Design a protein around this ligand. Structure first.
Ligand code: FE
Ligand code: ZN
Lengths: 194, 211
């Protein structure tokens, strides 16, 4: 008559590493070095600097919007998973949001590694179809008359949102302006606030 | 591949686990989490054993319930481990001995992939294109919600990359193609069951045709 099992993930993860490193395959310090990069160099502070510069420099803003790779290359912030950059501009009538519905594709060197919520099945499934409801649940209310545009990162372009400069930031220096540009403003789910 | 990973448009999921600007804490919340991206780069860049596209596809080859129940960083531990074994660098046995337990891998590929189209069309910004209504069992960077649909090109890349459907299977006929940002009206993609305005998808030239 006709009538998955896994070791703990930490034991599987360390096993994979120990199998490679044993075989002379992982360079000395290689994994540790990447951990440092991911932690220290790939940062949303870089994206915030590019946004505070665009907000105060119209010519740099136009360069960022026409050739985003060239504008990031001026700072030397290009890198793995951030080699072809396109910045997308929010206007009074348009709110842009980025997702990788197929996995997690994110402009690492300038936004930092994707947060867990961005990689969730919930965000990947819902934001392409009901971005106004998803952003509302996360705490960002977008008025009915503003178009929402979702950029689904499906190939090699890596995106960063250029949000609107808030009213009330007149005479603010670039340092002051960088401070209100969060990781979530750069993904497109938060609006920068004063 | 029309797998469970192609989630955009799926209904029944609850809230995204985040309020805007909540403190996310460190990059890595568990001590092994940095290993899958590090070892993937060791394979891509140090060993030249597989491409990044092969890492996207092997995660899509995880059995569907196993994909759905596995957290993000663990899917890449299983993904990278499967490619080491498939590439003959490691064996499943030695992983299980070192893990002191079962290490199930992704399922074998059911497709050999497809070459880059030999003859294609260069499109221009502002032109109306259709996403080819085609079904591909191996790796493809076309989410199913835009298959057969109509949009307007807003950007053509100045750079060119190997065709995913060929390089995600390690084939030698991947060529290189630009991709196009194709803007779709939300109602073109989900009728009246959407509250958004437009969706832009970055599609390889080979996925597109005029009109
Ligand atoms: Fe992704
Ligand atoms: Zn029975």
């Amino acid at each position: 008559i006709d009538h998955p099992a896994q070791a703990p993930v930490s034991d599987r993860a360390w096993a994979l590493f120990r199998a490679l490193d044993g075989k002379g395959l992982v360079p000395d310090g290689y994994v540790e070095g990447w951990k440092k990069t991911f932690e220290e160099d790939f940062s949303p502070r870089r994206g915030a600097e590019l946004v505070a510069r665009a907000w105060t420099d119209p010519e740099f803003r136009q360069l960022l919007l026409t050739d985003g790779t060239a504008a990031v290359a001026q700072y030397g912030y290009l890198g793995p998973q951030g080699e072809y950059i396109v910045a997308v501009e929010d206007t009074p009538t348009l709110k842009n949001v980025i997702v990788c519905s197929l996995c997690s594709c994110t402009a690492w060197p300038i936004l930092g590694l994707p947060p867990t919520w961005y990689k969730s099945f919930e965000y990947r499934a819902r934001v392409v179809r009901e971005p106004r409801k998803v952003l509302s649940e996360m705490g960002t209310e977008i008025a009915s008359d503003i178009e929402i545009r979702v950029y689904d990162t499906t190939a090699e372009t890596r995106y960063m949102v250029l949000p609107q400069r808030p009213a009330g930031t007149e005479g603010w220096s670039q340092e002051q302006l960088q401070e209100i540009v969060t990781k979530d403003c750069l993904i497109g789910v938060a609006i920068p606030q004063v | 591949m029309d797998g469970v990973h192609d989630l955009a448009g799926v209904q029944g999921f609850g809230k995204v686990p985040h309020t805007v600007n909540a403190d996310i804490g460190p990059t890595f919340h568990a001590e092994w989490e940095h290993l899958p991206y590090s070892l993937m780069f060791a394979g891509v860049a140090e060993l030249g054993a597989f491409s990044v596209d092969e890492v996207r596809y092997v995660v899509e080859r995880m059995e569907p319930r196993h994909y759905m129940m596995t957290p993000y960083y663990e899917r890449y531990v299983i993904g990278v481990a499967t490619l080491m074994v498939e590439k003959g660098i490691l064996t499943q046995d030695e992983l299980e001995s070192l893990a002191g337990g079962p290490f199930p891998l992704s399922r074998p590929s059911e497709s050999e992939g497809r070459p880059a189209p030999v003859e294609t069309t260069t499109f221009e910004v502002g032109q109306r294109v259709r996403v080819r209504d085609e079904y591909v069992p191996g790796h493809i960077r076309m989410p199913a919600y835009c298959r057969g649909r109509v949009g307007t090109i807003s950007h053509r890349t100045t750079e060119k990359w190997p065709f995913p459907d060929a390089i995600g299977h390690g084939r030698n006929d991947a060529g290189e193609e630009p991709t196009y940002h194709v803007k779709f009206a939300a109602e073109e993609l989900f009728g009246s069951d959407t509250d958004g305005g437009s969706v832009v998808v970055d599609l390889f030239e080979g996925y597109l045709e005029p009109a």
